[PDB]
Amino acid sequence: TNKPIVLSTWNFGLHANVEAWKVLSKGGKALDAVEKGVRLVEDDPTERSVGYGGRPDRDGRVTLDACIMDENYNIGSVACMEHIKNPISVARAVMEKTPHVMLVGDGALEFALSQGFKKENLLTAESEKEWKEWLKT
Amino acid sequence: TNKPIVLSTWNFGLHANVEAWKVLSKGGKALDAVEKGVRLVEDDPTERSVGYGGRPDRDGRVTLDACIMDENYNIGSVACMEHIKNPISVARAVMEKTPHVMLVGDGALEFALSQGFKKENLLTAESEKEWKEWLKTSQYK
Amino acid sequence: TIGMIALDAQGNLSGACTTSGMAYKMHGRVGDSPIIGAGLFVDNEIGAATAIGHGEEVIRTVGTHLVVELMNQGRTPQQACKEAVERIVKIVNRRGKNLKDIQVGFIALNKKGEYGAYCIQDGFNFAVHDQKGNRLETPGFALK
Amino acid sequence: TIGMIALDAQGNLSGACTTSGMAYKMHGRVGDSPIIGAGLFVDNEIGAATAIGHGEEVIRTVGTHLVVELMNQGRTPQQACKEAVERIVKIVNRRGKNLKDIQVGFIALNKKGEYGAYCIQDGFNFAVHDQKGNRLETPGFALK
Numbered sequence: 001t002n003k004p005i006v007l008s009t010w011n012f013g014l015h016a017n018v019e020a021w022k023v024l025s026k027g028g029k030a031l032d033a034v035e036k037g038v039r040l041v042e043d044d045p046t047e048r049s050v051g052y053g054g055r056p057d058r059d060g061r062v063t064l065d066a067c068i069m070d071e072n073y074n075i076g077s078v079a080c081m082e083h084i085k086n087p088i089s090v091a092r093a094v095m096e097k098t099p100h101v102m103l104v105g106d107g108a109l110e111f112a113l114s115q116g117f118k119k120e121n122l123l124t125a126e127s128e129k130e131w132k133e134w135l136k137t
Numbered sequence: 138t139n140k141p142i143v144l145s146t147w148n149f150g151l152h153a154n155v156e157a158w159k160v161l162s163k164g165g166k167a168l169d170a171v172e173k174g175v176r177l178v179e180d181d182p183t184e185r186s187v188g189y190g191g192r193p194d195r196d197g198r199v200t201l202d203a204c205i206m207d208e209n210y211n212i213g214s215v216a217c218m219e220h221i222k223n224p225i226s227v228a229r230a231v232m233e234k235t236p237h238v239m240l241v242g243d244g245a246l247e248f249a250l251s252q253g254f255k256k257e258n259l260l261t262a263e264s265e266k267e268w269k270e271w272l273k274t275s276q277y278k
Numbered sequence: 279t280i281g282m283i284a285l286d287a288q289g290n291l292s293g294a295c296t297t298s299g300m301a302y303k304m305h306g307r308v309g310d311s312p313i314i315g316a317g318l319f320v321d322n323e324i325g326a327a328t329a330i331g332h333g334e335e336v337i338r339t340v341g342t343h344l345v346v347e348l349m350n351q352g353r354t355p356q357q358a359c360k361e362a363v364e365r366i367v368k369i370v371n372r373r374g375k376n377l378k379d380i381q382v383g384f385i386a387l388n389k390k391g392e393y394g395a396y397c398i399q400d401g402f403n404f405a406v407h408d409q410k411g412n413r414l415e416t417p418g419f420a421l422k
Numbered sequence: 423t424i425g426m427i428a429l430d431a432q433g434n435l436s437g438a439c440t441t442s443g444m445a446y447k448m449h450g451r452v453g454d455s456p457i458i459g460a461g462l463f464v465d466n467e468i469g470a471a472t473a474i475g476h477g478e479e480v481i482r483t484v485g486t487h488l489v490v491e492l493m494n495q496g497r498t499p500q501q502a503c504k505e506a507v508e509r510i511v512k513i514v515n516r517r518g519k520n521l522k523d524i525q526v527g528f529i530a531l532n533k534k535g536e537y538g539a540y541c542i543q544d545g546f547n548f549a550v551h552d553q554k555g556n557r558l559e560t561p562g563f564a565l566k
Contacts, residue, residue, distance in 0.1 A: 073338050073339070073372070100304055101334045101338060102307065102308040102309075103304065103306040103307060104306045104308050106305070107305035110305060111304065
């Protein structure tokens with residue numbers, strides 16, 4: 001068996017993998033490794049397809065979707081959630097702390113605040129500019 | 138081949154099936170039959186697990202989820218949509234009139250309003266009273 | 279929730295699912311009803327399925343997609359519903375949960391207009407209308 | 423979107439998917455990333471998979487659940503990803519759409535730590551880290 005091992009999507013996976021590997025190489029759990037791996041990209045405002053710096057919807061709202069699945073069919077999911085930089089971690093909170101597996105929209109944000117996540121402005125200057133430029137075309 | 142044929146869930150399925158069969162027995166499309174069929178139950182306030190008359194969330198809000206799928210992998214879905222009595226038909230509109238397959242929340246309602254659907258109050262007196270009863274037994278705030 | 283699947287006079291399938299969800303859910307909770315593959319799945323070369331039961335459990339097992347894939351592998355509708363529920367019971371055990379706390383079931387149709395239904399628990403009925411008229415049937419159930 | 427799937431030193435699988443979604447989407451649009459069976463699926467007795475491409479098309483085909491069931495049925499991760507893309511290509515054709523307008527792909531891992539990937543179109547790479555190191559790998563694609 002070839003283990004531990006992590007795979008991730010796109011070129012930005014390569015640096016995300018290095019973060020995941022800090023957990024996996026020390027014998028840590030796959031769930032912790034994938035969360036930390038993807039949070040790196042969530043946090044990065046220069047990666048504009050994930051998390052902070054995300055290109056907005058047509059109304060200028062940055063809305064994020066995420067889900068997580070562990071080794072025993074535990075799942076959590078958020079969708080269309082605004083203002084929280086680490087949706088993967090809210091998803092993990094939906095999984096671990098509620099009787100539900102998916103929260104969306106304002107409900108998802110309410111829940112996130114109840115768990116201590118911090119409300120933030122995820123629309124960067126660069127994404128705002130490009131959005132206003134798109135409104136022109 | 139045994140066709141046409143329709144199946145639906147629960148005892149109220151029997152009543153939906155009658156509606157569906159008005160389409161199917163005349164050679165109509167499955168997609169139209171299923172939409173007509175489930176809209177009966179959405180419309181009925183005494184059916185308290187679908188549409189109008191639906192039991193609210195813990196905050197007293199009636200939020201509806203629906204999806205539809207045709208014979209050639211076209212799909213539409215709405216989730217957590219308030220105020221629209223017929224979410225199956227909004228889902229149908231997501232499918233037919235947008236480049237998306239799933240809208241949720243305030244966006245689902247906004248799109249519904251743009252398609253000519255009307256805001257309605259889906260919370261019945263009966264459902265409001267039972268909700269209030271639950272607030273007491275569960276002590277939720 | 280109501281789920282409905284049909285096979286029309288042209289031999290085409292479609293389906294629909296619609297719900298108010300679990301009473302007194304957390305605001306923003308979504309169940310299986312609007313999720314393709316969970317609450318509803320339709321493939322005109324194979325069959326269609328729609329689900330009942332606790333939404334969270336249908337979502338975690340992708341249940342209607344599973345039923346239709348079993349039909350694709352050659353199971354009849356009834357065999358597919360049962361075998362889906364049997365896989366799902368194993369998963370409940372793997373989870374360490376009590377089967378009595380979990381209801382999942384399916385109704386299914388194929389391109390022949392053969393049909394089937396199965397659930398974890400007794401207590402569900404479904405309505406079937408074909409040229410022999412409309413009727414309420416009961417499915418097999420695993421928890422005996 | 424980033425999806426990530428891992429097999430740890432204990433031999434357990436887990437996965438995560440997170441996105442900002444399609445740029446300039448309609449308010450409220452949801453793609454495949456939060457949908458279990460579409461953007462992500464993990465079964466610790468079989469394997470895991472996560473999806474890339476147009477969200478609407480991953481949802482439509484329930485693609486990661488498909489890839490994992492193909493592994494269940496004896497396909498390698500590479501074989502499963504390729505077969506799932508080939509069935510999706512057939513569906514795009516049945517739909518009358520132009521394959522150039524549709525990107526779907528998958529990455530997959532099994533319980534032995536075998537892995538693989540495949541996509542409709544070129545231009546996608548994945549990253550893989552194991553004890554030999556971290557590598558950027560470029561999978562095959564159907565649209566040639």
